[PDB]
Design a protein around this ligand. Structure first.
Ligand SMILES: *[C@@H]1O[C@H](CO)[C@@H](O[C@@H]2O[C@H](CO)[C@@H](O)[C@H](O)[C@H]2NC(C)=O)[C@H](O)[C@H]1NC(C)=O
Ligand SMILES: *[C@@H]1O[C@H](CO)[C@@H](O[C@@H]2O[C@H](CO)[C@@H](O)[C@H](O)[C@H]2NC(C)=O)[C@H](O)[C@H]1NC(C)=O
Ligand SMILES: *[C@@H]1O[C@H](CO)[C@@H](O)[C@H](O)[C@H]1NC(C)=O
Ligand SMILES: *[C@@H]1O[C@H](CO)[C@@H](O)[C@H](O)[C@H]1NC(C)=O
Ligand SMILES: *[C@@H]1O[C@H](CO)[C@@H](O)[C@H](O)[C@H]1NC(C)=O
Ligand SMILES: *[C@@H]1O[C@H](CO)[C@@H](O)[C@H](O)[C@H]1NC(C)=O
Ligand SMILES: *[C@@H]1O[C@H](CO)[C@@H](O)[C@H](O)[C@H]1NC(C)=O
Ligand SMILES: *[C@@H]1O[C@H](CO)[C@@H](O)[C@H](O)[C@H]1NC(C)=O
Ligand SMILES: *[C@@H]1O[C@H](CO)[C@@H](O)[C@H](O)[C@H]1NC(C)=O
Lengths: 251, 361, 120, 99, 49, 50
């Protein structure tokens, strides 16, 4: 079942500063009180990240995946529930679905027929995100990942047929923009998908009383191949990082 | 020392002659806990099987496939593997497993093979010549035969052309054997291609129903996730063993560690990116990897003109891991430690010197 | 620990022997350097118990009896301010003996002038 | 920065040792930097070639380390000879040599 | 300027960093040598007219 | 082909750097001698013969 949303208000996308966000652990290796230089797909410091709103604004477009995706979420009341991954987003090719419903998180790699406007609805009794599921190659059910009160950082990577999902939960009290600080993203789950992904789309949840969009805001950043100098403390968490290509001082 | 110096007379001094290697004693191969086994219960122990024309294909992914349970069973009459050996199935890993299940006659089991010819191969189920997998068949007269006759199993008897490998034909169109059009009615030269089997429990062994499961193993560029169950050797600590933890291998002494890892971290590295800490996959505990006590072997001797007594210094080796005395330089064997202080004759190190008076340090 | 690698490595001859011999030469050279610099006296001199030197104070350079290492305050400060087949051989002379050699040199140059360097 | 001269020697030796360890993680054109992976993933005719590539790369690294250590040893020996000269002429006697 | 050559060269490790470090050490050593030999006075003396 | 050229050029560059280090050591010794002559012959009168 699909429903066209025709009550949106047209608005240009916003842009903002990445500051020192988007850092994640490159590997599953503990390091103590040491500085490690690594070459990987990292998000550039102080970069231009695209800002999307949900307020009548309901921003669910399809964006190019490129080499990786940094997803930042200033979230309250859990509007954002999942993501859409693929190349053509139809039954011709194979697509990846990430959903967090009221009980658990479901990850599926199948040939899905996506709606033009996919969404959920809130008791949660409205699921309108797909119309078909034909050929499945991978299914995985896991534990649930989840003023704006919550900040959710995610990193999605497609390297050698591995899908890396990195995530971090942060307690913030900032009203509008991204807070300035350091928070290294822990690796959450590696998925054996082995599929091509070039486009993605956020999945939101409707509020029904037509429909109402809950207050949420999210940010999209793009990963570029670069070198970071990571600092590991005595307890083994990354507390600070240096972008080697940002300015001559950090170089 | 004479061998190393290429001389039969050795001048007084200390000569580094060899190296002392602690030899590894055991092999410790710890991989993760054996969980999430593959659904072989729903294929082999199914209450009903499909017909050979409409053979069931089940995709097996994201689990651990234990092939020794199937191989060591005595319930299977045929376990013929083509393109791979059964012994290494429990070790190798594959991206996906295709389990094709059907029922055929006793005499038709031979036709489920690459390069064969028959009704089943040409018209019902065709295997490729370059097939990697195993064909498992067993007698099912107890379940699939009834006294009245079990006509729930169908097979294709006629088709215009032979089937392609891994093709399913479920068409029920009237076969045209003659020039005349069938017109949808079964008359002369026009026969229905699907014919029922008539399994009965009083049949011969060549006509009794046999359940056949064919496993197809393919490797694709996607990450292979159907792996065999890697066995785990019990953990041994405080000894120089060869460790293999989740594919990270090496040689070392595994001792208890006070390092508190974060839950996502598995291995530990120092400044020089060498693994000195590790997390055991079976039990989530942290182990320090101390390198085995390799050291230099030096021979301390006076002149051969004076005496043939020698002492051995193991550099940087504790005396419990090899007239035995412990020095900061290493373990000295063959020299009697004295409390008196003299001038240095043969330098040992860390303030220790050796002399001949027996050999004293 | 790879036996095949060692078998292939034996084809290259005595490269390993040359590297080990060069490192051994460097290691004995360091001890020889320390011996040449610090061990220039064969008598261990000590200062008198009463530090009456005509008004000259040497407390900052003489060994401190309170410290277990028997180092001078300046030497203690200097020591505080300095912060796969690999082995580190210990030096032949320990830090205590090097401090003792410096103490002997200081005692000789304070109590005997330059006479101790040229004779009794 | 009073004691920079000793700290430079300590830093150079430690950095050279660190570089020598980090050269082990380089494959030098082979498929992997681990001998076990090559021995387990390839047959002996090609594993011999890959192991040979690792052997020549590591041997070149070790020769480079030993050569630079020898040069530094020569420099330290010269400095120690100078220090022994200062010990003999400035401490054990009074020197008329200017500066 | 070949990027493929640099990608293959990165497999050999930090040889280039070592060579650059050695050359930098020699280059600063030459300036240190000149500074040690000629700059032994901190006052610029001048002869009388 | 690039592997052969890289190993040859790397060996050449390592040889050049080693020769430069040895020559730099020789020049450093000569410069230390020159500084000693500057201190003892120019800034003072030396009793050392020759
Ligand atoms: C919501 O709008 C989309 C956008 O037009 C509709 O998608 C079209 O569906 C028709 C159906 O035959 C196709 O011919 C068009 O090519 C589609 N266009 C795109 C851009 O996808 C969608 O069908 C609408 N939803 C419903 C339920 O009608
Ligand atoms: C020699 O100098 C030392 C150190 O400068 C003098 O020791 C000091 O004595 C005063 C007087 O009690 C104390 O307040 C200082 O704390 C002492 N300094 C130290 C480092 O202990 C010493 O008195 C001087 N004279 C003699 C004869 O030793
Ligand atoms: C971000 O990009 C937009 C257009 O893509 C541009 O108008 C804006 O100035 C950019 N911001 C920065 C800080 O460069
Ligand atoms: C969430 O989705 C899973 C997968 O289909 C399902 O088992 C579960 O019942 C769903 N929960 C809700 C509340 O819809
Ligand atoms: C994919 O699905 C279509 C229709 O559902 C089917 O005809 C086709 O055979 C399937 N292909 C694979 C590889 O599963
Ligand atoms: C992935 O998809 C993009 C867009 O459809 C295509 O251009 C590219 O060739 C694909 N890559 C692979 C390896 O299939
Ligand atoms: C490590 O954590 C402990 C408590 O878990 C804390 O007291 C300590 O300050 C931390 N150390 C660092 C370097 O952050
Ligand atoms: C299937 O049935 C047999 C016979 O009872 C039993 O031994 C076996 O454990 C069952 N399961 C499998 C996976 O073979
Ligand atoms: C692994 O299984 C053993 C018992 O076989 C159990 O004691 C242990 O807690 C398990 N470990 C994990 C991480 O599941």
């Amino acid at each position: 079942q699909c429903v066209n949303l025709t009550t949106r208000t047209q608005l240009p996308p916003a842009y903002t500063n990445s500051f020192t966000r988007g850092v994640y652990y490159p590997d599953k290796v503990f390091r103590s009180s040491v500085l490690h230089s690594t070459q990987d797909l990292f998000l550039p410091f102080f970069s231009n990240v695209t800002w999307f709103h949900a307020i009548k604004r309901f921003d669910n477009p399809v964006l190019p995946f490129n080499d990786g995706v940094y997803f930042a979420s200033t979230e309250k009341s859990n509007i954002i529930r999942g993501w859409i991954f693929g190349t053509t987003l139809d039954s011709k090719t194979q697509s990846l679905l990430i959903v967090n419903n009221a009980t658990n998180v479901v990850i599926k790699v199948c040939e899905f027929q996506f709606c033009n406007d996919p969404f959920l609805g809130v008791m949660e009794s409205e699921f309108r995100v797909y119309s078909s599921a034909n050929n499945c190659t991978f299914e995985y059910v896991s534990q649930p990942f989840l003023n704006f009160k919550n900040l959710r950082e995610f990193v999605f990577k497609n390297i050698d047929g591995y899908f890396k999902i990195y995530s971090k939960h942060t307690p913030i009290n900032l009203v509008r923009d991204l807070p300035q600080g350091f928070s290294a993203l822990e690796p959450l789950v590696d998925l054996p998908i082995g599929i091509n992904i070039t486009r993605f789309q956020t999945l939101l949840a409707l509020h029904r009383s037509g429909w109402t969009a809950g207050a949420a805001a999210y940010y999209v950043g793009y990963l570029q191949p670069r070198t970071f100098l990571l600092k590991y403390n005595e307890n083994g968490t990354i507390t600070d990082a240096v972008d080697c290509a940002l300015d001559p001082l950090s170089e | 020392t004479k061998c190393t110096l290429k001389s039969f007379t050795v001048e007084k001094g200390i000569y580094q002659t060899s190296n002392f290697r602690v030899q590894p004693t055991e092999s410790i191969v710890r991989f993760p806990n054996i969980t999430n086994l593959c659904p072989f219960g729903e294929v082999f122990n199914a209450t009903r099987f499909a017909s050979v024309y409409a053979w069931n294909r089940k995709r097996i992914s994201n689990c651990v496939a234990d092939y020794s349970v199937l191989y060591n069973s005595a319930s299977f009459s045929t376990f013929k593997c083509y393109g791979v050996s059964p012994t290494k199935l429990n070790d190798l890993c594959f991206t996906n497993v295709y389990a094709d299940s059907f029922v055929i006659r006793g005499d038709e089991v031979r036709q489920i093979a690459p390069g064969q010819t028959g009704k089943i191969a040409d018209y019902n189920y065709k295997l490729p010549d370059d097939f990697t997998g195993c064909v498992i068949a067993w007698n099912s007269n107890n379940l699939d035969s009834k006294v009245g006759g079990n006509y729930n199993y169908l097979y294709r008897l006629f088709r215009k052309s032979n089937l392609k490998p891994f093709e399913r034909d479920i068409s029920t169109e009237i076969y045209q054997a003659g020039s005349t059009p069938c017109n949808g009615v079964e008359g002369f030269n026009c026969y229905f291609p699907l014919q029922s089997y008539g399994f009965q429990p009083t049949y011969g062994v060549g006509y009794q129903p046999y359940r056949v499961v064919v496993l197809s193993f393919e490797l694709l560029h996607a990450p292979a996730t159907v792996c065999g169950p890697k066995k785990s050797t019990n953990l041994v600590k405080n000894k120089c063993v060869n460790f293999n933890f989740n594919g990270l291998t090496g040689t070392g002494v595994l001792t208890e560690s006070n390092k508190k890892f974060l839950p996502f971290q598995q291995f530990g590295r120092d400044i020089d990116d060498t693994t000195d800490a590790v997390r055991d996959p079976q039990t989530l505990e942290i182990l320090d990897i101390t390198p085995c006590s390799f050291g230099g072997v030096s021979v301390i001797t006076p002149g051969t003109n004076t005496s043939n007594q020698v002492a051995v210094l193991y550099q940087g080796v504790n005396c419990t891991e090899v007239n035995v005395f412990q020095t900061r330089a290493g373990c000295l064997i063959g020299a009697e430690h004295v409390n008196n202080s003299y001038e240095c004759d043969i330098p040992i190190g860390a303030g220790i010197c050796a002399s001949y008076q027996s050999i004293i340090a | 620990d790879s036996t095949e690698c060692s078998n292939l490595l034996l084809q290259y001859g005595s490269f390993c022997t040359q590297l080990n011999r060069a490192l051994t030469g460097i290691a004995v050279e360091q001890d020889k350097n320390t011996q040449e610099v610090f061990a220039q006296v064969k008598q261990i001199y000590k200062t008198p118990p009463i530090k009456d030197f005509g008004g000259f104070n040497f407390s900052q350079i003489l060994p401190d009896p309170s410290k277990p290492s028997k180092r001078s305050p300046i030497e203690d400060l200097l020591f505080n301010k300095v912060t796969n087949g690999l082995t580190v051989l210990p030096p032949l002379l320990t830090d205590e003996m090097i401090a003792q050699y410096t103490s002997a040199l200081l005692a000789g140059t304070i109590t005997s002038g330059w006479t101790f360097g040229a004779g009794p | 920065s009073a004691l920079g001269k000793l700290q430079d020697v300590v830093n150079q030796n430690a950095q050279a040792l660190n570089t020598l360890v980090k050269q082990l993680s380089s494959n030098f054109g082979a498929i992997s930097s681990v001998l076990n992976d090559i021995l387990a993933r390839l047959d002996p005719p090609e594993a011999e070639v890959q192991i040979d590539r690792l052997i020549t790369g590591r041997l070149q690294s070790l020769q480079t380390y030993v050569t630079q250590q020898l040069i530094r040893a020569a420099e330290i020996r010269a400095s120690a000879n100078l220090a022994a000269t200062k010990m003999s002429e400035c401490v054990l006697g009074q020197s008329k040599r200017v500066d």
